[PDB]
Structure 1
Amino acid sequence: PRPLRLPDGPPCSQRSKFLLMDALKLSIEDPSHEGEGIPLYDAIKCMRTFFGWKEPNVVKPHEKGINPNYLLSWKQVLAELQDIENEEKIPRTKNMKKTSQLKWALGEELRSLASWIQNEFNKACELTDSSWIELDEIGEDAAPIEHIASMRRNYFTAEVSHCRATEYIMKGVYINTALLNASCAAMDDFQLIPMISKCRTKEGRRKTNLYGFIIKGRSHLRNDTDVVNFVSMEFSLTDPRLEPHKWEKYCVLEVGDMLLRSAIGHVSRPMFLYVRTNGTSKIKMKWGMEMRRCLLQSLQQIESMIEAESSVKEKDMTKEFFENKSPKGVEEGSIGKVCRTLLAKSVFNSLYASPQLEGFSAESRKLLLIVQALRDNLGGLYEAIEECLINDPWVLLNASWFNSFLTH
């Protein structure tokens, strides 16, 4: 009966492991330098495509942190990358000096819904100008797949291969793979770990992208829940003073100026560096390495809808579904947007996983069925649900969405 009660408070703030809509890439095309494919070599080549660096300064301090240490840490990254450029053979990995600023940074309340998380979600459903996965990316079948399964997979893949949520998947798979590997290969080192992704342009050109860096702390991970701390340093064109509540956990630096094409001609815009301390565990990195399953889970939700239509119509409805041939339209606007919306929710469930999300998802689905039953044919459950509406942006956004469902 009642709409869910969302908490009052200061706006919720960003809590993802890496930047989403605000990320910025320095990229190299068709890379062919010596040692191409080694993360550190790619990172340096990406860094050297940019000529607008300048003396960095704090433009949005971290209110609870030691801001001079975040500044020192970024200047240390740049200095140590220069040292690598001066060694004859670029090494495969780079362990940072255990400076005072890095030792500090590596560790050696009700919130209301803010509009930024819905905007993040809209951004994640969008198409980009690049493809982020191969044609046979989805699935892990041992045997060749049937004709109908293949047809459905190829339809779906064409709709999500360029999706921004798919960039987040591959970004997430790469950085969790590299951090989990470093956590056992270099347990005592403050290893510098580039944040990289790869894509293919519309013209078919292979591109390598640098988002920033993380520096990992000491990582003797004896069990799945042991934490390795890290410091993330991420490029962005987003000025943090426009939405400061989003950036509560970050110290934000201004590190350069970038020349850009736009709807005017060339414009110069400042480049920022978003810095925060963070942590993760073996179990979370293993999930991060599995983010490609978001593609399979969302494909299966689509296949479920096709199999429903195919049972009512005693025929395979794959083509009629994906070509939008009984329904006379698509509420989201197009079949492609249905696919990408399903994918973005799966991805955000992974990016923003939490016990609040798990609690809200089960208990709200119970209230859901009850309210349809009362709708079609005509307490303390509310406490279970609203116990999960504390401060998590994604859970709060889903609660807001649920209330749109109650109104309609």
Structure 2
Amino acid sequence: PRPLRLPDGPPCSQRSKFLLMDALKLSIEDPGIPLYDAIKCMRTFFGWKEPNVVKPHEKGINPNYLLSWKQVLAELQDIENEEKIPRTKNMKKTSQLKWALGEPELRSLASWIQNEFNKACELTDSSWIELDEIGEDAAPIEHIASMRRNYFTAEVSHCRATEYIMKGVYINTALLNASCAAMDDFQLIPMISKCRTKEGRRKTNLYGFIIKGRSHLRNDTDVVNFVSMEFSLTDPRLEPHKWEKYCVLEVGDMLLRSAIGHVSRPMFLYVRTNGTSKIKMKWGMEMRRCLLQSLQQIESMIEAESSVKEKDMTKEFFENKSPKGVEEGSIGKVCRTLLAKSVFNSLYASPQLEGFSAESRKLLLIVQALRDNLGGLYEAIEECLINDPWVLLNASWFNSFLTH
């Protein structure tokens, strides 16, 4: 009956482990060691300038974030003089890094998280996975399953949510490996991804750096702290509420092709302290399963049309030949919307998300039963609507489904 009661308060703020729509890549074309790749990426940019804070972290020590970035640059400059470029780089345990590495309450839905989700559904001009990326099969797959995987892949291989998948897989792999290979060190860990242009060129991408703290992770739940430093062209002063947890530097200027001619835009560095655990880094390494999970949701839809029409409906589904249209607009957009929901469930995982997902499915089945044939549950759901952007956006969406 009643729409969900969304909490009131200041707008919700970004809480992902890395930047999503706001990320910026420094890239090298047709390039294997992350630190060497990062330096060559840094040396493609010439608009660096003396960094200063432009959006302070309200609760943190902003001079230390500034000092940490200047330390990163200074220590990368050192590596450029040591004879062979080493495989890894352990930061000096400066006072700013010791500080930064660490050695109720209601928020309202803000529009940025819907925007993030729309962005995750879009196509980029690069492919982020190989043609045989999806799946774990010991054996050759049957002909129909293959056809389905190939159709699905063509629709998501360039999708932005797939870039998020591989970005997350890379940085979680690197952090987890560093966590046992360099337990006592403040290791400098580049944030790298890899894609292939439409013309087939291989590109290596640098988003920024993380620095991990001490990581004596005896448990799955033991926490390793880190400082993330991420490039961006997003001016934080347009949506300051999004950036509550960040100190934001201006660190350069970049010359860009636009719908106008060439333009110069400031380049920013989003800095925050964060943490993660073994168990979260292991899930982060498994994000390719989002591809598999959303494929299987698509296969479900094909199997239902295929039993009803007593023929295999794979070609007629993906080619859009019973239904007379596709509400999202195209088969492609449906695949990418399913993918983005799955990826965002992983990026924004939480107990709030878990509680909302189960209790809201109960209210949905009940409400459909009422729709087709005509207190307590509401408290379990709304006990999860506190301050998480992804949960709040999903509750917003649920209320659309209640109005329709």
Q: TM-score range by the shorter chain?
A: over 0.9
Distance 2:109 2:85 in 1: 47
Q: Secondary structure at the match of 2:14?
A: coil
Q: Which residue of 2 aligns with 1:170?
A: 166
Distance 1:68 1:201 in 2: 39
Distance 2:93 2:244 in 1: 26
Q: Report the TM-score, using the length of structure 1 for normalisation.
A: 0.99
Distance 2:323 2:310 in 1: 16
Question: In the TM superposition, what whole-angstrom CA distance separates every residue of 1:212-236 from its partner, at most 9, and x where no partner exists?
Answer: 0000000000010000000000000
Displacement of 1:64 in angstroms is 0.1
Q: Secondary structure at the match of 2:102?
A: coil
How many residue pairs end up in the alignment? Answer: 403
Q: Which residue of 2 aligns with 1:15?
A: 15
Aligned: 1:257 with 2:280:
no
Question: In the TM superposition, what whole-angstrom CA distance separates every residue of 1:279-318 from its partner, at most 9, and x where no partner exists?
Answer: 0000000000000000000000000000000000000000
Aligned: 1:144 with 2:140:
yes
Displacement of 1:178 in angstroms is 0.1
Displacement of 1:150 in angstroms is 0.2
Q: Which residue of 2 aligns with 1:34?
A: none
Displacement of 1:103 in angstroms is 0.2
Displacement of 1:41 in angstroms is 0.1
Q: Secondary structure at the match of 1:70?
A: helix
Distance 2:110 2:368 in 1: 29
Consecutive aligned runs of 4 or more in structure 1 exceeding 2 Å deviation:
none
Displacement of 1:7 in angstroms is 0.3
Displacement of 1:48 in angstroms is 0.2
The alignment's C-alpha RMSD in Å is: 0.2
Distance 1:212 1:223 in 2: 28
Distance 2:243 2:77 in 1: 30
Displacement of 1:244 in angstroms is 0.1
Q: Secondary structure at the match of 1:86?
A: coil
Distance 2:377 2:242 in 1: 31
Q: Which residue of 2 aligns with 1:24?
A: 24
Question: In the TM superposition, what whole-angstrom CA distance separates every residue of 1:253-300 from its partner, at most 9, and x where no partner exists?
Answer: 000000000011100000000000000000000000000000000000
Distance 2:24 2:270 in 1: 11
Distance 2:296 2:50 in 1: 50
Q: Secondary structure at the match of 2:76?
A: helix
Distance 1:233 1:379 in 2: 45
Distance 1:405 1:41 in 2: 50
Question: In the TM superposition, what whole-angstrom CA distance separates every residue of 1:103-162 from its partner, at most 9, and x where no partner exists?
Answer: 000000100000000000000000000000000000000000000000000000000000
Q: Which residue of 2 aligns with 1:190?
A: 186
Displacement of 1:91 in angstroms is 0.3
Q: Percent identity?
A: 100
Displacement of 1:24 in angstroms is 0.1
Displacement of 1:86 in angstroms is 0.3
Distance 1:305 1:143 in 2: 25
Displacement of 1:242 in angstroms is 0.1
Q: Secondary structure at the match of 1:210?
A: strand
Aligned: 1:85 with 2:111:
no
Distance 1:39 1:273 in 2: 20
Displacement of 1:83 in angstroms is 0.2
Distance 1:265 1:406 in 2: 46
Q: Secondary structure at the match of 1:71?
A: helix
Displacement of 1:341 in angstroms is 0.1
Gaps of 5+ in 2: none
Distance 1:152 1:188 in 2: 47
Distance 1:101 1:263 in 2: 41
Distance 2:203 2:307 in 1: 44
Displacement of 1:78 in angstroms is 0.1
Distance 1:287 1:20 in 2: 18
Question: In the TM superposition, what whole-angstrom CA distance separates every residue of 1:161-213 from its partner, at most 9, and x where no partner exists?
Answer: 00000000000000000000000000000000000000000000000000000
Distance 2:178 2:259 in 1: 43
Q: Report the TM-score, using the length of structure 2 for normalisation.
A: 1.00
Distance 1:102 1:367 in 2: 48
Q: Which residue of 2 aligns with 1:98?
A: 93
Question: In the TM superposition, what whole-angstrom CA distance separates every residue of 1:44-98 from its partner, at most 9, and x where no partner exists?
Answer: 0000000000000000000000000000000000000000000010000000000
Aligned: 1:68 with 2:63:
yes
Distance 1:379 1:394 in 2: 24
Q: Secondary structure at the match of 1:364?
A: helix
Q: How does 1:8-407 map to 2 (within 5 A)?
A: 8-31=8-31, 37-108=32-103, 109-407=105-403
Distance 1:389 1:362 in 2: 13
Distance 2:18 2:153 in 1: 25
Q: Secondary structure at the match of 2:80?
A: helix
Distance 2:192 2:280 in 1: 19
Displacement of 1:336 in angstroms is 0.2
